[PDB]
Paper text:
The results described previously indicated that FoRham1 was an l-rhamnose-α-1,4-d-glucuronic acid lyase. The structure of FoRham1 comprises a seven-bladed β-propeller domain, and the Rha–GlcA is bound to the cleft at the center of the anterior side. The active site of FoRham1 is located on the usual anterior surface of the β-propeller fold.
Recombinant enzymes that were heterologously expressed by the secreting system of P. pastoris are often glycosylated, and high-mannose type N-glycan was observed in protein crystal structures. To investigate the effect of N-glycosylation on the crystal structure, we crystallized the N247A mutant as an N-glycan–deficient form. The crystal of the N247A mutant was isomorphous with the WT protein crystals, and their crystal structures are virtually the same (Cα RMSD = 0.077 Å). This result revealed that N-glycosylation did not substantially affect the three-dimensional structure of FoRham1.
Numbering used by the authors: 1 to 419
The structure:
């Protein structure tokens, strides 16, 4: 596997503040290809200036040829909270509607949707009046909608879309799932799916494939990030309603954090393992987790693999040149190609201030981590476009630069792979 071409686009000037609001690990998702177009969402500074931001949505054609990015500005909702949790997630349902949820730390939901199926019936002009107003509920469903943190969308096989989030707080919280029907345009409540016990679960993502939904998490005892422990796994065959552990034993609904039957790796507190890193169901149905720890005596990224035979392995990701991360350094992701043979680590390097792209192969049990490419000058938790990789073999990554405001840009990097 090699790189055929590298291209980049600047899509905006990043916002100013003590926190990163753009390029946050648990954006799910920031960058999406649907049909022949790619979409991206981010904050830009509003005319009021410092500590006033608007959500922007960009689109560009990517098939059968790539055209120019265009942007709309949602100038009816001003983001004002300088808190690194207050990021944006986007999802696109099979009716072509684009959904956004954003700007939360332990507050009520903020959600909006496009009026029509703009990703399906693609409009000529790209303007803010394509979107309905911000609301604080999910029409058809029920709360609780507060205190909410961490909206995450997952598109299902039939065009429906899940929205998942935590209700409660760091160190005492539960998570919930809601399902949007692309046939009726109504949401329904799947209810609480994981319940804290004077702690909270921190999932790594949602991963849906061929009718199964996969998640992994660590449990956090207090608002101190040193109090994460364990790596846990469960999956569902019914889009979030009921769940199983790795041995296919049905769990209680909700899953409790006190239930050790979902633990796949013991990792104590003070291991320097961070919450909400990365996960991946590969196209062959092998599940992967990206985390980190200091348990070897050095800080290293860690790859957990759920093998076809049922067994779990844990391998450090330690290719030449990669500096290992500590607890508060930027988080990475794992991406997969269409074939399921190639695993990409998209790993921010805290020494280099860059994003490395490393590749391993299923033929070598993913032990053969090799440097494939680099994105220079990043201070970001890198995020990629699953569908674009599957469909065209192009690894497209959304990044916040390193550097000072207003030099620090937002960009999209495309690596064309020679599959
Ligand atoms: Na607690």
């Amino acid at each position: 596997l090699t790189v055929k071409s590298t291209k980049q686009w600047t899509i905006g000037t990043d916002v100013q503040g003590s926190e990163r609001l753009n390029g946050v690990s648990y954006q799910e998702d920031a960058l999406i290809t649907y049909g022949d177009y790619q979409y991206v969402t981010f904050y830009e500074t509003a005319p009021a200036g410092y500590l006033n931001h608007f959500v922007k949505v960009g689109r560009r054609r990517v098939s059968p040829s790539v055209g120019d990015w265009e942007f709309l500005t949602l100038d009816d909702y001003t983001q004002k909270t300088m808190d690194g949790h207050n990021m944006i997630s986007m999802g696109i349902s099979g009716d072509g509607k684009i959904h956004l949820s954003f700007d939360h730390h332990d507050v009520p939901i903020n959600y909006r949707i496009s009026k029509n199926g703009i990703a399906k019936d693609v409009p000529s002009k790209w303007t803010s009046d394509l979107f309905d107003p911000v609301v604080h509920e999910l029409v058809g469903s029920q709360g609780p909608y507060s205190p909410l943190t961490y909206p995450r969308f997952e598109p299902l096989g039939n065009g429906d879309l899940l929205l998942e989030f935590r209700i409660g707080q760091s160190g005492s919280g539960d998570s919930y799932i809601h399902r949007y029907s692309a046939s009726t345009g109504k949401w329904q409540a799947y209810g609480m799916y994981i319940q804290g016990d004077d702690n909270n679960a921190y999932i790594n993502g949602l991963d849906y494939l061929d009718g199964k939904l996969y998640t992994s998490w660590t449990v956090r005892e207090t608002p101190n990030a040193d109090t994460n422990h364990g790596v846990y796994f469960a999956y569902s065959n019914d889009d979030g309603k009921t769940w199983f552990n790795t041995a296919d034993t049905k769990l209680t609904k909700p899953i409790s954090t006190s239930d050790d039957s979902t633990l796949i790796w013991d990792i104590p507190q003070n291991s320097r393992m961070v919450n909400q890193e990365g996960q991946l169901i590969d196209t062959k149905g092998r599940f992967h987790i990206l985390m980190r720890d200091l348990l070897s005596g050095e800080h290293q990224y860690q790859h957990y693999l759920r093998k076809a035979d049922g067994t779990w392995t844990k391998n450090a990701i330690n290719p030449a040149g990669l500096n290992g991360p500590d607890l508060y350094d930027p988080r990475g992701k794992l991406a997969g190609d269409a074939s399921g043979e190639y695993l990409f680590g998209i790993l921010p390097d805290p020494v280099k201030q860059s994003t490395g792209i490393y590749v391993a192969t299923a033929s070598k049990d993913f032990k053969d981590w090799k440097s494939l490419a680099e994105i220079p000058n990043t201070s970001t938790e890198p995020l990629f476009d699953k569908t674009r990789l599957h469909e065209s073999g192009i690894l497209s990554v959304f990044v916040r630069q390193a550097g000072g405001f207003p030099d620090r840009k937002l960009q999209v990097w495309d690596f064309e792979l020679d599959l």
